[PDB]
């Protein structure tokens, strides 16, 4: 009950974490693409 | 006992989120820099 409220907050944090892990990986892929353009030029 | 467990885990997840938000924002700031560099040379 307070245990359910906390289990739920925890689920939401773990979901945010999954989300942030993709978003940080994509940013990393874009940086490598922008650096590749810079290096080529 | 289990509520903290959950409390403990909630601290750990919030800590991982803070780290990922910083890594993301570092990369975003780097993307802005590469874009400015590229568009300006
Ligand atoms: Cl790179």
From Swiss-Prot, chains A, B:
Subcellular location(s) per record: Cell membrane; Apical cell membrane; Cytoplasmic vesicle, Phagosome membrane; Cell projection, Cilium, Flagellum membrane
The entry's comment on post-translational modification says: Proteolytically cleaved in sperm. The cleaved protomer forms homodimers and heterodimers with the full-length protomer. It confers reduced dependence to intracellular pH changes.
Side of membrane Cytoplasmic, spans? 1-41
Q: Where does this protein have coiled-coil stretches?
A: 1-41
Where does tissue-level expression of this protein occur?
Enriched in immune tissues, such as lymph nodes, B-lymphocytes, monocytes and spleen. Expressed in spermatozoa. Expressed in respiratory epithelial cells.
From which domain of life does this come?
Eukaryota
Give the UniProt family note. Answer: Belongs to the voltage-gated proton channel (VPC) (TC 1.A.51) family.
Q: How does it assemble?
A: Homodimer; each protomer forms its own proton conduction pathway.
What does it do?
Voltage-gated proton-selective channel that conducts outward proton currents in response to intracellular acidification. Lacks a canonical ion-channel pore domain and mediates proton permeability via its voltage sensor domain. Appears to play a dominant role in regulation of CO2/HCO3(-)/H(+) equilibrium in sperm flagellum. Prevents the acidification resulting from HCO3(-) synthesis and thus sustains high HCO3(-) levels inside sperm for capacitation.
Can you quote the domain comment?
A: The voltage sensor domain (VSD, segments S1-S4) conducts both gating and ion permeation. The segment S4 is probably the voltage-sensor and is characterized by a series of positively charged amino acids at every third position. Unlike other voltage-gated ion channels it lacks the pore domain.
Protein name as it appears in the record? Voltage-gated hydrogen channel 1
What's the source species for this entry?
Answer: Homo sapiens
Gene coding for it: HVCN1
Within the intact protein, the region shown is 226 to 266 of 273
């Amino acid at each position: 009950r307070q245990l359910l409220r906390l289990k739920q907050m925890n689920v939401q944090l773990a979901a945010k974490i999954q989300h942030l892990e993709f978003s940080c990986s994509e940013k990393e892929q874009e940086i490598e693409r922008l650096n590749k353009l810079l290096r080529q030029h």
